[PDB]
Structure 1
Amino acid sequence: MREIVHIQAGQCGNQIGAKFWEVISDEHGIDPTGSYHGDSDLQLERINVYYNEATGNKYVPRAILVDLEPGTMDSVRSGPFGQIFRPDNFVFGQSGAGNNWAKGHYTEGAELVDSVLDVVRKESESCDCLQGFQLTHSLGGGTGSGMGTLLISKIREEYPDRIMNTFSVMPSPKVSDTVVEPYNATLSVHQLVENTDETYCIDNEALYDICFRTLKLTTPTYGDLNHLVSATMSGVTTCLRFPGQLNADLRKLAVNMVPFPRLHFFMPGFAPLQYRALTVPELTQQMFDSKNMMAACDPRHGRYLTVAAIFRGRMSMKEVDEQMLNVQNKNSSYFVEWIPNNVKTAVCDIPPRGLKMSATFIGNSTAIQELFKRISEQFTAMFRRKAFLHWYTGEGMDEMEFTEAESNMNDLVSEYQQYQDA
């Protein structure tokens, strides 16, 4: 029945994951205790996609919470919708990962990974027809980055024929915890290139700029940043969670969006970012605007391979179709000519909370290379002096593995530039 298994790893992965569940539980009418109290059967028609039906007509998220320290997951359990999560699905260590990819991937995380897989297996076994997996994590830390990609590697071994997608938060010096973030990110990107079908690249620099420049927040917190991520994740999963014209699972959606296996790193977008409702032209304009992009990449610096757009709310579908056909025919130079009709649009009647109507952007642009270039610059800047490497070699890693990760991402960059000049 097209069930999705959700996994969240690390500090960022769990805090963002929790907000996601907090938002969609509200949309489906599920209270923190797991009881349904909505007002429409449309909220329950595809409730099985992310929720398991309990004994007493309760709905428990198909989510698995992973960390190497209990700090963040204790905060989740003490949160608003904390009691909604299945207790056994809380898998945690005590040591922590210390913002170290090696600790998450090779030492500390390796000691815990089988425990997570047992929970994954337990959730998967009770699925009528498993649709795929979904991971929320950061790439700049240790747990979500190192253990997260290790989990993905394991899942692909046990479930080679299942879709593996991630919502990955990209590190940025503007919003940074440690200096080793480019090290952890480069190591993780190599894993994602090979072992995921779709990765939504969420840039913290972009999130910061949106909160500061647009949302007019002088001192943006992680909470403010996760508000944008939560709203985007809701929009991306809207067509999967609600009835509509679109009858597609993760695989079919992946087929129409990914023309080349390695090039599957998407730029998320959202509109609006107020009492005055937006018009369809305004939604479409903002949706394609760089200021609504969350990968911190300028789409004009590249070309769109494929584009997906999801509209929510009661609106003129003719006007939507006209406006989408307006942007494409006014900026046809930014869409590849060797992929006919690469821009697809879906509408959903049920709007998110607080907005009468909204729009979510999913772009497979070659401009995403700017993100990897940026990470690669920061990486090389330290690695040429072998700086901070002792943290990693102390966990058993060799310099060669760093050189290889560096080379694979430069290859990824070169691959993107290959189709930008096509």
Structure 2
Amino acid sequence: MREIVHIQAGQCGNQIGAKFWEVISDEHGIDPTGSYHGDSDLQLERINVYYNEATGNKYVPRAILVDLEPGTMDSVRSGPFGQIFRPDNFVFGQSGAGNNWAKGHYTEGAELVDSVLDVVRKESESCDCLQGFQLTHSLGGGTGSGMGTLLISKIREEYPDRIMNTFSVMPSPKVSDTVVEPYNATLSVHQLVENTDETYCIDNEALYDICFRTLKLTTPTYGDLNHLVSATMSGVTTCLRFPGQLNADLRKLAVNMVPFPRLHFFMPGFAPLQYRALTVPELTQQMFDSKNMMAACDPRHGRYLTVAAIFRGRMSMKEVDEQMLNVQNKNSSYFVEWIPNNVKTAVCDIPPRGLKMSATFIGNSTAIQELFKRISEQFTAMFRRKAFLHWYTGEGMDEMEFTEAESNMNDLVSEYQQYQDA
């Protein structure tokens, strides 16, 4: 049944995890009580990818909610679909992680991970065929970042032949909790390079820009940022949740999207960001604009190794291909020439809530290096003076471990750059 286990960890993880389930429950007809009230059976043909069947024939998300403090966890339970979640599947502690990677990964989080894995194992064991795991988390805090990557390391140990997928929100000074966010995120990136197969870079800088230059919002809230994440996450999982000509799954996605096993960091894109549906030429133009990227890199700076785009609504399959093949042969300077058919398209007849035409795009571009460069700069600026390190060495970490993470990420930037000129 190719089931997926979903894990949300920390403030950002559980906030943008909640919306995800709010969005796709609506798309699948499941109300805040877990009862299905839908018109089409397209809503139910692949509903076991993300939902467990209940005793009352209800649907319960295959979702594990994880935090080191219960602040955001109680707020999820009181939000719209809060009672949808299996109550045994809220796993939390009380001390928090203080925006500290070491606390999440080595001390506070080490105390709580074993119980989370009991809920993974409970969910994993009741799965006919398990594709793998989907983690939602930020990288600049402590729980989602440090404890999140700890969970990833332990899941890879218990389940090494399953796929590990993350939605990974990147920190940015424009939406900044603390000055130590580059430390937390450099450390987390080293984990993700090694221990995931596919990671969606959701950059909070791009999300703030799209909110402020484009959607005409002069002070955007986290709720506006997350509405963009909600739509991206729905579209990027459409081919998993809905029956298509494409039997998309997490392993096929990785095989076709990742040519080299460390370059698995995808740039999402969405359109549109109203009562006039867009024309297929507007979907295609907007999607591939730098202004519709959820990761804050100009794709005109590097090249697409691979791309996977999905168009949602009732539209001209021939015009999709017409317009797709158009923007390639208009901008073929920004795709690699040595991967035949590296741009793949699909269409789903079911559109997302309140949009007649939409289009989500997955991009494995080498311009993602600009994000890692940006993180790496902010990191060295502090670490050259060993500033703020006392928070980490107080939890047991050595300066050595930092130099290593810096090193592995600057390598990552090199590898991404070796293929930009290939």
> Given the two structures, how large is their TM-score scaled by the length of structure 1?
1.00
Query: Secondary structure, in 3 states, of the residue corresponding to 1:133?
Result: strand
Query: Secondary structure, in 3 states, of the residue corresponding to 2:166?
Result: strand
For residues 132 and 68 of structure 1, the distance between their equivalents in structure 2, rounded to whole angstroms, comes to 24
Q: Which runs of 4+ in 1 moved over 6 A?
A: none
- Deviations for 1:377-419, whole angstroms, at most 9, x for unmatched residues? 0000000000000000000000000000000000000001100
- Deviations for 1:283-332, whole angstroms, at most 9, x for unmatched residues? 00101000000110010000000011010000010000111100111111
- Deviations for 1:6-46, whole angstroms, at most 9, x for unmatched residues? 00000000000000000000000100000011111110111
Query: Secondary structure, in 3 states, of the residue corresponding to 1:213?
Result: helix
For residues 182 and 318 of structure 2, the distance between their equivalents in structure 1, rounded to whole angstroms, comes to 45
For residues 36 and 230 of structure 1, the distance between their equivalents in structure 2, rounded to whole angstroms, comes to 21
Work out whether residues 132 and 162 of structure 1, in 8 Å CA contact, stay in contact via their aligned partners in 2.
Answer: yes
- What is residue 212 of structure 1 aligned with on the other side? 212
- What is residue 54 of structure 1 aligned with on the other side? 54
Aligned Cα root-mean-square deviation (Å): 0.5
- What is residue 13 of structure 2 aligned with on the other side? 13
- Deviations for 1:46-98, whole angstroms, at most 9, x for unmatched residues? 11010000000100000000000000000001111000000000000000000
Q: How does 1:97-136 map to 2 (within 5 A)?
A: 97-136=97-136
For residues 222 and 383 of structure 2, the distance between their equivalents in structure 1, rounded to whole angstroms, comes to 29
The farther-off stretch of 324-333 and 59-68 is 324-333
- Deviations for 1:146-179, whole angstroms, at most 9, x for unmatched residues? 0000000000000000000000000000110000
Query: Secondary structure, in 3 states, of the residue corresponding to 1:164?
Result: strand
Q: Give the unaligned 5+ runs of structure 2.
A: none
Percent identity between matched residues is 100
1:117 Cα deviation after fit: 0.3
1:357 Cα deviation after fit: 1.3
For residues 287 and 194 of structure 1, the distance between their equivalents in structure 2, rounded to whole angstroms, comes to 30
1:136 Cα deviation after fit: 0.2
For residues 148 and 286 of structure 1, the distance between their equivalents in structure 2, rounded to whole angstroms, comes to 33
For residues 349 and 47 of structure 1, the distance between their equivalents in structure 2, rounded to whole angstroms, comes to 17
Work out whether residues 366 and 420 of structure 1, in 8 Å CA contact, stay in contact via their aligned partners in 2.
Answer: yes
For residues 351 and 147 of structure 1, the distance between their equivalents in structure 2, rounded to whole angstroms, comes to 36
Work out whether residues 280 and 320 of structure 1, in 8 Å CA contact, stay in contact via their aligned partners in 2.
Answer: yes
The farther-off stretch of 243-252 and 313-322 is 243-252
Query: Secondary structure, in 3 states, of the residue corresponding to 1:154?
Result: helix
Query: Secondary structure, in 3 states, of the residue corresponding to 1:216?
Result: coil
- Deviations for 1:80-134, whole angstroms, at most 9, x for unmatched residues? 1000000000000000000000000000000000000000000000000001100
> Given the two structures, how large is their TM-score scaled by the length of structure 2?
1.00
For residues 325 and 405 of structure 1, the distance between their equivalents in structure 2, rounded to whole angstroms, comes to 40
For residues 311 and 131 of structure 1, the distance between their equivalents in structure 2, rounded to whole angstroms, comes to 24
Query: Secondary structure, in 3 states, of the residue corresponding to 2:174?
Result: coil
Query: Secondary structure, in 3 states, of the residue corresponding to 1:296?
Result: coil
For residues 399 and 240 of structure 1, the distance between their equivalents in structure 2, rounded to whole angstroms, comes to 42
1:243 Cα deviation after fit: 1.3
Work out whether residues 310 and 345 of structure 1, in 8 Å CA contact, stay in contact via their aligned partners in 2.
Answer: yes
- Deviations for 1:310-368, whole angstroms, at most 9, x for unmatched residues? 10000010000111100111111111111111000011010000100100011000000
Query: Secondary structure, in 3 states, of the residue corresponding to 1:42?
Result: coil
- Deviations for 1:157-214, whole angstroms, at most 9, x for unmatched residues? 0000000000000000011000000000000000000000000000001000001111
1:249 Cα deviation after fit: 1.6
- Deviations for 1:251-277, whole angstroms, at most 9, x for unmatched residues? 011100000000000000000001111
For residues 60 and 237 of structure 1, the distance between their equivalents in structure 2, rounded to whole angstroms, comes to 18
Query: Secondary structure, in 3 states, of the residue corresponding to 2:160?
Result: coil
For residues 202 and 253 of structure 1, the distance between their equivalents in structure 2, rounded to whole angstroms, comes to 18
Query: Secondary structure, in 3 states, of the residue corresponding to 1:18?
Result: helix
Q: How does 1:331-342 map to 2 (within 5 A)?
A: 331-342=331-342
Q: Does 1:82 align with 2:82?
A: yes
For residues 41 and 413 of structure 1, the distance between their equivalents in structure 2, rounded to whole angstroms, comes to 45
Work out whether residues 139 and 170 of structure 1, in 8 Å CA contact, stay in contact via their aligned partners in 2.
Answer: yes
For residues 281 and 245 of structure 2, the distance between their equivalents in structure 1, rounded to whole angstroms, comes to 21
For residues 270 and 154 of structure 1, the distance between their equivalents in structure 2, rounded to whole angstroms, comes to 33
1:248 Cα deviation after fit: 2.6
1:218 Cα deviation after fit: 1.1
Work out whether residues 20 and 233 of structure 1, in 8 Å CA contact, stay in contact via their aligned partners in 2.
Answer: yes
- What is residue 330 of structure 2 aligned with on the other side? 330
Query: Secondary structure, in 3 states, of the residue corresponding to 2:243?
Result: coil
1:226 Cα deviation after fit: 0.3
Work out whether residues 46 and 242 of structure 1, in 8 Å CA contact, stay in contact via their aligned partners in 2.
Answer: yes
- What is residue 283 of structure 2 aligned with on the other side? 283
Work out whether residues 245 and 347 of structure 1, in 8 Å CA contact, stay in contact via their aligned partners in 2.
Answer: no
